[PDB]
Structures are given as C-alpha cells and as structure tokens.
Design a binder for this molecule. Structure first.
Ligand SMILES: CC(C)(COP(=O)(O)OP(=O)(O)OC[C@H]1O[C@@H](n2cnc3c(N)ncnc32)[C@H](O)[C@@H]1OP(=O)(O)O)[C@@H](O)C(=O)NCCC(=O)NCCS
Ligand SMILES: C=C(C)CC(=O)O[C@H]1C[C@@]2(COC(C)=O)[C@@H](C=C1C)O[C@@H]1[C@H](O)[C@@H](OC(C)=O)[C@@]2(C)[C@]12CO2
Length: 443
C-alpha cells in the first residue's frame, strides 16, 4: 500500500488532466523478434513494480467540493503498469519503418490515436474525472520493420524530467540491471514537502502571470516538426553570442533556438497584427537544480519563465537581444523564490482553479515552449537487442495554438522542434527565407 500526496505544483488543475506522451522508434530486422521484445518488456515492468510499487499506481483526487479543488495522491491501482501491445504490421493506415525514414519521422506519423495508450488531452472515452488516471501507461506498436514504444505519464505525477527518470529505470529493469541507492532514494523522496513554503505569504510577484483574472485574457491550426542541423544550431548560437546585452555574459544553444523561434513567429505575425501587439514567451524550466533536488526525482518540479515585449520589438531586435531576455530569468535564486511562491500560493488555497502556468498567455501572440532537449531518452535500449532509438518523437494530438516542444537532442546535436500554429502563421513561416535558412520542415 501507498498514499503519496502529489507535489504541490502537481495539484495545478491543468496538469491533473493531461498525459505527456513520447515515442521511441527502433528498427526490428525480423518479425521473429517480437515475442521476446514483449516478454522482456513485461518482465521489466514486473521487476520495476516490485522495486518501486507506486509506479503501478493511479492519481486519485479527494476532498473535492464547491470552492475546494481537493488534493490528489498516488494510490494503488494494478499490480504492474499497463502495457498495450498493438500489431500494425498489416494495417495499411499505420506507419512503416521505410515510410518513416523517407519522410524524416514526421509528427503526423506518430498519431496518438494509433500509437499511444491514452490521449494527451481529456477528450473522448475514459477521460472523465471518475475514470482511473494511471501514473504511467505504455504501448508497444509493431510496425513493418520496426517497433514504436510510447510512454504516457500523468502530468500531475511527473514532468518530462521525472518521466525520463522513470523510463530510465524501466530500461534498467528490462535489462535486469540493479538500481543504485541514490536512484532508489530519489524515487521515494516525499513530494509534499519538497518545495519549502514561504512564511506568512499571501500574494507577490512570484505568481505574476500565473493567476487567472477576469480582466486579463489567457482557429484552424496544425502541428509540424522542423529540424535544425548541428551546424544550424551552432550558427544560431554564434549569431546570438555576437549580439548579447551588456548584462548577459553568455547564452545557451537552447536559448538561441528559443529566441529564433520567438523572433520568427513574431516576424510572420506582423503580416496579420500590428507591431505594437504585446507578446509573451512562456518557457518551461526544470526547478530541480534551483531547489537542490536530484535529476532523478521522478515528480513534478517545474515552473515557467515569462518574457513580455511587443511583436515588432521581438521581430526587429538582434537574436542576442532576444536570447538575453530568456537567459536573464534563469538565475537559480530567482527560480527558487518564484517556485516557492507558486507552491505556497497553491498550498494556501483550497480552490486552485484560478492557477495556471499560462494564465495570461494569448494564443494569438504568445509562445508556450517546453524543451525536452536535455532528457536522456536516446540512450535507452530496454534490453530489447535492437540498439538505441532511431528517433525520439512526440505524438501528434489536437492543435494547441502557440504550444511548442523541443525533442530530446539527437546525439549528433540535431534539434527537432514541434510547433503548433494557426494555418496562416504556419504557411508564412514555412515560406519565410530567414526561417528556412535554419529550419527544415518535416511535418
Ligand atoms: C531552461 C532550460 C531549457 C535551459 O536549457 P539550457 O540552456 O540547455 O541549460 P542551462 O541553463 O543549464 O545552460 C547550460 C548552457 O549554458 C552554458 N554555460 C554555462 N556556463 C557557461 C560559461 N561559464 N560560459 C559560457 N557558457 C556557459 C553551457 O555551455 C550550456 O550551453 P550549451 O548547451 O550551448 O553548451 C533547462 O534548464 C530546462 O529547465 N530544461 C527542461 C525544461 C522542461 O522541463 N521542459
Ligand atoms: C491544452 C491544455 C488544456 C493546456 C495546455 O496548453 O497544456 C500544454 C502545456 C503544458 C501544460 O499546460 C498547463 C497549462 O499546465 C504541457 C502540456 C500541454 C498539453 O506541456 C508543456 C509542459 O509540460 C507544461 O509546463 C510545465 C509543466 O511547466 C506546459 C505548460 C508546457 C508548455 O510548457
């Protein structure tokens, strides 16, 4: 038995209704290999569950009433995490290894309805509040010449850093490799106390842009992957580094690409709105380092940084000026104070319904980006004997205007950005020469 209160940050209403999906593609030389793939994977899930029982649990809310959004806990569910096995080898609507390779692994070929065990959003059958919310769900998809492994994580229970930590240990378990003491410790840290609260706190700048207000706001669209070569990435960082603000010593590769996207989106948006239009960049940031928490902590410990300007200013300023905006918010002391503030506000409020990481983001003019660039998914083989993933891609789901992801970085340095934009923005972006100089459309 177990009853593990979610991270206070994981009590965010938005996170409690969402599943984060990621797919790993492996080539499979011969269909003779599938039975052992499945048994190895099932045995791994069993071993993992025996070692860390809560991974087989579910997220369950209690104490809900009028003006009380309740408190969720990880509690028992089934003996092992659920894996679904789907054979798509003979399905003419399914992807194939050669189709994937020819098209460069587009998002459209990772259809969540076909290759994921549950949808990202609370849409359709089995996504109601009374329906179970398993902590993790897995799907093994056999495709012609390949295997797609998809992992869903309940977002209240884990951010992608936590999900990566869970998946990493699942790979060990599949191989029958032992967990380290530090791994076992990280997997079992108490969550409800992991962010120390602020004393006598009501409301401060810490929760700016995170509480919905009635006088503050916060279309045909699509998803597409764009790739950026290692050379494109280094040239973007070079361009930014040459043009930094005086207050900024350095920026990162991730900063530079993030800035380039904000600038490029803002540029194409000038074709439909005025340069004076406000624009907010919302950037997901792992709060573990600022909090002094292990990278192996499997929970939800994330915040955003917010950057407000105008469409014209962002479009027209140097790349370094834009990258400097992003880097300026990553001071550990600032991240810690802000994150403690958000956690404290949540803790102090039985009604959490007004709190949102994108509370004042306007989908028309904002960018909401989460970078998974630094997660370790490219390294896991799960004892399957297939080698490392050929690609690591997020499944396509409903378009969500201005939502964006960076995939885990390909070992050679290649980046893959998933962008969701309204059609007129997407079309203009794809035809924009300043964008296509660096960005290769995949789809
Ligand atoms: C916010 C976030 C995306 C920033 O990513 P990041 O810039 O790659 O990571 P960091 O802030 O740790 O910065 C490391 C970078 O700073 C650079 N840097 C650090 N010290 C430096 C110095 N002394 N001189 C020059 N560069 C330096 C590093 O070289 C590295 O840049 P690189 O990747 O181009 O080599 C990341 O911290 C994060 O939270 N990711 C997860 C987001 C999520 O959960 N979703
Ligand atoms: C459409 C949903 C109903 C709300 C939404 O935009 O969710 C995004 C953003 C986000 C969660 O959104 C909210 C409002 O909490 C998450 C997943 C999804 C589907 O991805 C990314 C990430 O996992 C979340 O951010 C965190 C956890 O800090 C998130 C903010 C994101 C863009 O950064």
């Amino acid at each position: 038995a177990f009853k593990i209160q979610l991270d206070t940050l994981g009590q965010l209403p938005g996170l409690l209704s969402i599943y984060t999906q990621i797919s790993l593609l492996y080539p499979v030389s011969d269909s003779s290999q599938y039975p052992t793939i499945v048994s190895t994977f099932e045995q791994g899930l069993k071993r993992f569950s025996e070692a860390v029982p809560w991974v087989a649990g579910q997220v369950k809310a209690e104490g809900i009433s009028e003006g009380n959004t309740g408190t969720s806990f990880i509690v028992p569910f089934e003996d092992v995490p659920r894996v679904v096995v789907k054979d798509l080898r003979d399905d003419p609507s399914a992807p194939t290894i050669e189709g994937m390779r020819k098209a460069g692994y587009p998002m459209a070929m990772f259809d969540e309805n076909i290759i994921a065990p549950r949808k990202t959003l609370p849409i359709g059958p089995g996504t109601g509040p009374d329906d179970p919310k398993p902590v993790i769900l897995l799907q093994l998809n056999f495709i012609k010449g390949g295997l797609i492994l998809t992992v869903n994580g309940q977002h209240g229970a884990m951010d992608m850093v936590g999900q990566d930590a869970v998946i990493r240990l699942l790979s060990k378990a599949c191989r029958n490799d032992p967990f380290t003491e530090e791994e076992m410790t990280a997997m079992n840290l108490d969550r409800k106390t992991i962010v120390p609260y602020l004393e006598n706190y009501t409301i401060g700048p810490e929760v700016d842009h995170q509480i919905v207000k009635a006088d503050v706001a916060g279309v045909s669209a699509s998803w597409a992957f764009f790739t950026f070569s290692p050379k494109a990435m280094s040239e973007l960082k070079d361009a930014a580094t040459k043009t930094l603000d005086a207050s900024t010593k350095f920026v990162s590769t991730d900063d530079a690409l993030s800035a380039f996207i904000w600038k490029s989106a803002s540029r194409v948006r000038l074709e439909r709105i005025d340069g004076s239009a406000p624009t907010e960049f919302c950037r997901a940031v792992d709060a573990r380092p600022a909090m002094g928490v292990s990278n192996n902590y499997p929970g939800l410990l994330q915040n955003m940084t917010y950057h407000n300007s105008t469409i014209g200013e962002i479009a027209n300023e140097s790349l370094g000026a834009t990258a400097s905006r992003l880097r300026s918010e990553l001071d550990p002391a600032s991240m810690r104070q802000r994150t403690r503030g958000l956690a404290t506000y949540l803790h102090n409020n039985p009604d959490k319904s007004n709190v949102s990481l994108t509370a004042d983001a306007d989908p028309s003019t904002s960018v909401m980006l989460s970078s998974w660039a630094k997660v370790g998914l490219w390294d896991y083989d799960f004892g399957l004997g297939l080698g490392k993933p050929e690609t690591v891609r997020r499944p396509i789901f409903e378009p969500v205007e201005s939502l964006m992801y960076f995939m885990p970085k390909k070992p050679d340095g290649e980046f893959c950005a998933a962008l969701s934009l309204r059609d007129e923005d997407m079309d203009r972006l794809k035809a924009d020469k300043e964008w296509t100089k660096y960005a290769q459309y995949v789809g």
